[PDB]
Amino acid sequence: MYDAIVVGGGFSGLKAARDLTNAGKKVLLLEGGERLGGRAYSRESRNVPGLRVEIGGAYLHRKHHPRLAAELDRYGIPTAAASEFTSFRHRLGPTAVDQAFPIPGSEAVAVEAATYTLLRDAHRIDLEKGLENQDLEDLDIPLNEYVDKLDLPPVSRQFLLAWAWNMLGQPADQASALWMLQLVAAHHYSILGVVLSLDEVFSNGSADLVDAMSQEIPEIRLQTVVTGIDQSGDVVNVTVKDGHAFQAHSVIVATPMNTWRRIVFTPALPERRRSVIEEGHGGQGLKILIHVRGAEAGIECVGDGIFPTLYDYCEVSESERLLVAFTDSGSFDPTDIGAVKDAVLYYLPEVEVLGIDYHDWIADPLFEGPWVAPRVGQFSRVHKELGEPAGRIHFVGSDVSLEFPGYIEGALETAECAVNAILHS
Amino acid sequence: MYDAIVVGGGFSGLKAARDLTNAGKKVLLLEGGERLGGRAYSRESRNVPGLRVEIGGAYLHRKHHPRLAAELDRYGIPTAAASEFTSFRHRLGPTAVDQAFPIPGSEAVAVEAATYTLLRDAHRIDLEKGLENQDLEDLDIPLNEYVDKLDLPPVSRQFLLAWAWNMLGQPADQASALWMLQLVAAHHYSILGVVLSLDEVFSNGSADLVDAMSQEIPEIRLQTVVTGIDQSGDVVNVTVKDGHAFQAHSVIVATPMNTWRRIVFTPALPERRRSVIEEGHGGQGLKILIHVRGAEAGIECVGDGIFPTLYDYCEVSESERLLVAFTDSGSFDPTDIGAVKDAVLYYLPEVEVLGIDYHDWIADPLFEGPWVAPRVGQFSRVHKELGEPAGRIHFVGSDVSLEFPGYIEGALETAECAVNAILHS
Ligand SMILES: Cc1cc2nc3c(=O)[nH]c(=O)nc-3n(C[C@H](O)[C@H](O)[C@H](O)COP(=O)(O)OP(=O)(O)OC[C@H]3O[C@@H](n4cnc5c(N)ncnc54)[C@H](O)[C@@H]3O)c2cc1C
Ligand SMILES: Cc1cc2nc3c(=O)[nH]c(=O)nc-3n(C[C@H](O)[C@H](O)[C@H](O)COP(=O)(O)OP(=O)(O)OC[C@H]3O[C@@H](n4cnc5c(N)ncnc54)[C@H](O)[C@@H]3O)c2cc1C
Ligand SMILES: NCCc1ccc(O)c(O)c1
Ligand SMILES: NCCc1ccc(O)c(O)c1
Ligand 4 atom index nearest CA of B168:
1
Region for B397 from its dihedrals, namely left if φ exceeds 0, alpha if ψ lies in -120 to 50, beta otherwise: left
Contact B112 A196 (CB under 8 A): no
Contact A120 B120 (CB under 8 A): yes
Residues of A in contact with B119 (CB under 8 A): 112, 116
Residue A405 CA to residue A411 CA, distance in Å, equals 8
DSSP B156-223: HHHHHHHHHHHHHTS-TTTSBHHHHHHHHHHTTS-SHHHHHT--EEETT-THHHHHHHHHT-S-EESS
Ligand 2 atom index nearest CA of B414:
26
Q: Where would I find the beta strands (DSSP E) of A241-349?
A: 243-253, 264-266, 285-293, 299-302, 309-315, 320-328
Nearest-Å Rg of the Cα atoms of chain B is 22
Residues of B in contact with A123 (CB under 8 A): 116
Domain boundary among B371, B392, B416: B371
Same domain, B261 and B286: no
Nearest protein CA to atom 50 of ligand 2, as residue: B57
Continuous H helices in A216-318: 274-279
Contact A398, A67 (CB under 8 A): no
Q: How far B193 CA lies from chain A's nearest CA (Å)?
A: 7
The answer to whether the peptide bond before residue B365 is cis (omega within 30 degrees of 0) is no
Rounded to 5, what percent of chain A is helix, strand, coil?
A: 35, 25, 45
Breaks (C-N over 2.5 A) in chain A follow: none
Q: How many structural domains is chain A composed of?
A: 2
| Pairing state between β B52-54 and B42-44 | antiparallel
Residue A366 CA to residue A360 CA, distance in Å, equals 11
- Going by C-alpha positions, the residue among A422, A420, A8 that lies closest to residue A238 is A8
Residue B315 CA to residue B317 CA, distance in Å, equals 6
Ligand 4 atom index nearest CA of B372:
1
Same domain, A252 and A305: no
- The residue to mutate among A288, A368, A398, having the most atoms of ligand 1 within 8 angstroms of its beta carbon, is A398
Contact B101 A105 (CB under 8 A): yes
Secondary structure class of A158 (helix, strand, coil) = helix
Same domain, A100 and A183: yes
- Please check whether residue A106 touches B, CB under 8 A: no
Same domain, A28 and A155: no
Identify which ligand lies nearest to the alpha carbon of A327: 3
Same domain, B261 and B361: no
- The residue to mutate among B367, B372, B408, B412, having the most atoms of ligand 2 within 8 angstroms of its beta carbon, is B408
Element (H, E) at A200: strand A200-202
**CATH number for position B350:** 3.90.660.10
Nearest Cβ partner for A105 among B100, B112, B191: B100
Contact A386, A276 (CB under 8 A): yes
Residue A77 CA to residue A82 CA, distance in Å, equals 15
Domain boundary among B371, B387, B409: B371
Contact B354, B322 (CB under 8 A): no
- Please check whether residue B59 touches A, CB under 8 A: no
Q: How far B3 CA lies from chain A's nearest CA (Å)?
A: 45
Contact A87, A224 (CB under 8 A): no
Ligand 2 atom index nearest CA of B225:
42
- Going by C-alpha positions, the residue among B248, B278, B304 that lies closest to residue B5 is B248
Residues of B in contact with A192 (CB under 8 A): 108-109, 112
| Pairing state between β A2-7 and A87-88 | unpaired
C-beta of A256 in contact with ligand 1 (< 6 A): yes
Task: Name A37's bridge partners.
Answer: A10
Contact B393, B265 (CB under 8 A): yes
Q: How far A111 CA lies from chain B's nearest CA (Å)?
A: 10
Please count the CA atoms within 13 angstroms of the CA of A191 that sit on its side-chain side.
Answer: 24
Same domain, B364 and B297: yes
Question: What is the count of residue pairs from A and B with beta carbons less than 8 Å apart?
Answer: 43
Domain boundary among B371, B395, B414: B371
User: Chain A interface, mutation test: which of B190, B195, B196, most A Cβ atoms within 10 Å?
Assistant: B190
Q: Which CB contacts under 8 angstroms, 24+ apart, belong to A356-359?
A: A356/A47, A356/A288, A356/A289, A356/A290, A356/A291, A357/A45, A357/A46, A357/A47, A357/A53, A357/A55, A357/A288, A357/A289, A357/A290, A357/A291, A357/A322, A358/A55, A358/A286, A358/A287, A358/A288, A358/A289, A358/A334, A359/A41, A359/A55, A359/A56
Contact A119 B100 (CB under 8 A): no
Task: Name B246's bridge partners.
Answer: B238
Task: Name A315's bridge partners.
Answer: A321
Write the DSSP symbol of residue A398: G
Residue B144 CA to residue B181 CA, distance in Å, equals 13
Domain hosting residue B316, numbered range: 83-197+281-371
Q: How far B199 CA lies from chain A's nearest CA (Å)?
A: 13
Q: At CA B94, angle to CA B93 and CA B97, rounded to 5? A: 90
C-beta of A379 in contact with ligand 1 (< 6 A): no
Q: Is the dihedral of CA A209, A212, A213, A219 positive or negative?
A: positive
Residue B404 CA to residue B413 CA, distance in Å, equals 8
| Pairing state between β A59-60 and A200-202 | antiparallel
Continuous H helices in A261-336: 274-279
Residue B122 CA to residue B6 CA, distance in Å, equals 34
Contact B54, B24 (CB under 8 A): no
Task: Name A59's bridge partners.
Answer: A201
| Pairing state between β B236-240 and B226-230 | antiparallel
| Number of Cβ atoms within 10 Å of the Cβ of B103 | 19
Contact B65, B408 (CB under 8 A): yes
Residue A8 CA to residue B407 CA, distance in Å, equals 67
Residue B58 CA to residue B56 CA, distance in Å, equals 6
Residue B90 CA to residue B162 CA, distance in Å, equals 11
Contact A255, A8 (CB under 8 A): yes
- Going by C-alpha positions, the residue among A274, A228, A231 that lies closest to residue A30 is A228
- Going by C-alpha positions, the residue among A136, A387, A409, A125 that lies closest to residue A277 is A387
Secondary structure class of A347 (helix, strand, coil) = helix
Same domain, A59 and A136: no
DSSP B97-109: -SSSS---GGGHH
Residues of A in contact with B101 (CB under 8 A): 105, 108
Contact B55, B33 (CB under 8 A): no
Ligand 3 atom index nearest CA of A406:
1
C-beta of A17 in contact with ligand 1 (< 6 A): no
Secondary structure class of A239 (helix, strand, coil) = strand
| Pairing state between β B226-230 and B264-266 | parallel
Same domain, A399 and A264: yes
Contact B116 A120 (CB under 8 A): yes
| Number of Cβ atoms within 10 Å of the Cβ of B278 | 9
The answer to whether the peptide bond before residue A102 is cis (omega within 30 degrees of 0) is no
Rounded to 5, what percent of chain B is helix, strand, coil?
A: 35, 25, 45
Report how far ligand 2's centroid is from the alpha carbon of B256 (Å). 7
Task: Name A228's bridge partners.
Answer: A239, A264
Q: How far A24 CA lies from chain B's nearest CA (Å)?
A: 43
- The residue to mutate among A165, A191, A307, A371, having the most atoms of ligand 3 within 8 angstroms of its beta carbon, is A371
Nearest Cβ partner for A108 among B105, B123, B192: B192
Same domain, B220 and B304: no
**What residues 280-319 of chain B have any CB closer than 8 A to a CB of chain A?**
none
**CATH number for position A275:** 3.50.50.60
Report how far ligand 1's centroid is from the alpha carbon of A256 (Å). 7
**CA-to-CA separations, B298 to A415, B162, B178, B321, B350, in angstroms, rounded:** 59, 19, 33, 10, 15
Q: Which CB contacts under 8 angstroms, 24+ apart, belong to B19-24?
A: B19/B415, B19/B416, B19/B419, B20/B419, B20/B422, B20/B423, B21/B216, B21/B217, B21/B218, B22/B216, B23/B419, B23/B423
User: Chain B interface, mutation test: which of A97, A115, A194, most B Cβ atoms within 10 Å?
Assistant: A115
Q: How was this structure determined?
A: X-ray
- Please check whether residue B119 touches A, CB under 8 A: yes
Residue A82 CA to residue A200 CA, distance in Å, equals 5
For A275, residues 6+ apart whose C-beta sits below 8 A from its C-beta are: none
Secondary structure class of B82 (helix, strand, coil) = coil
Q: Exposure of A180 by Cβ count < 10 A (0-12 exposed, 13-18 middle, 19+ buried)?
A: buried
Residue B423 CA to residue B425 CA, distance in Å, equals 6
Contact B296, B87 (CB under 8 A): yes
Same domain, A35 and A106: no
Same domain, A252 and A312: no
- Going by C-alpha positions, the residue among A402, A57, A31, A383 that lies closest to residue A217 is A31
- Please check whether residue A86 touches B, CB under 8 A: no
Nearest protein CA to atom 31 of ligand 2, as residue: B10
Task: Give helix B143-150 / helix B177-186 axis angle, nearest 10°.
Answer: 80
What resolution in angstroms, rounded to 1 decimal? Answer: 2.7
Residue A303 CA to residue A90 CA, distance in Å, equals 5
Report how far ligand 4's centroid is from the alpha carbon of B198 (Å). 9
Question: How many Å separate Cα A122 from the centre of its chain?
Answer: 20
Nearest Cβ partner for A116 among B109, B116, B193: B116
Same domain, B319 and B383: no
- Please check whether residue B190 touches A, CB under 8 A: yes
Q: Is the dihedral of CA B199, B202, B205, B207 positive or negative?
A: negative
Residue A393 CA to residue A425 CA, distance in Å, equals 12
Q: What are the helix and strand counts (H, E) for chain A?
A: 11, 19
Residues of A in contact with B116 (CB under 8 A): 115-116, 119-120, 123, 189
Question: How many Å separate Cα B396 from the centre of its chain?
Answer: 14
To the question of whether residue A39 is assigned a binding role by annotation, the answer is yes
DSSP B100-144: SS---GGGHHHHHHHHHHHHHHHTT--TTT-TTSS--GGG-SBHH
Q: Is the dihedral of CA A42, A44, A50, A53 positive or negative?
A: negative
Residue B88 CA to residue B101 CA, distance in Å, equals 10
Report how far ligand 1's centroid is from the alpha carbon of A330 (Å). 20
Hey, what's the torsion of the CAs at B360, B366, B372, B374, to 10 degrees?
100
